[PDB]
Amino acid sequence: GAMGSMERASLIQKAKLAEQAERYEDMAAFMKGAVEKGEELSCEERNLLSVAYKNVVGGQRAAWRVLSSIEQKSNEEGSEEKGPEVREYREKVETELQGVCDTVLGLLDSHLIKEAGDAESRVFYLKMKGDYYRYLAEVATGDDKKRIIDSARSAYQEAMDISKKEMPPTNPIRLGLALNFSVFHYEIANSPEEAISLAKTTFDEAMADLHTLSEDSYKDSTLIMQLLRDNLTLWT
């Protein structure tokens, strides 16, 4: 690790600076360095890690989708052969995306998840594990595609089981987990009915618990509830 010589606190400080500068690759590298110091992450630090890699892989995914679209058009009946370049470059971006996902999964496996005992940390990390296997699934086409999908499903399921036992239904981590697991069902697992059921039940159970919340907690929970509603509107 090229961050091995930098103080943990300096890495966290520089991650925050990189965020302000919208330098998310740097932010991710700084947070990888911080994780590799071996200490557990605080709540703020976990979110710095997740924000950084979500932004990096989100850009990769958007680029991959553009290139995959161009590639599929080049392969339609009536297209002029353009040679191997579109496939090659899509593969290049794909390999870089897979590398980022493997990096994040590696950090979770060495050793964030195994040291995470509190529900807020353990559910957060298992959600991330589901998310990054989901991104691998989005580009997977080989002998391993089913296993990648099942790895995402298993991580999301363990996170769901913990969240239902240990968190209130309005907990934003619980809500965001359900939001994303619902998208996994719809987009990855060819299970739109499960996706819709999960989003609706999550929304309704949250609604019934909003009365317990402060104004600031209410704002956080209703924000994610609106994303659940948005997806349900897209799907029905």
Partner: peptide, 5 residues
């Protein structure tokens, strides 16, 4: 695309 967080 659907919303995720």
């Amino acid at each position: 695309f659907p919303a995720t967080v």
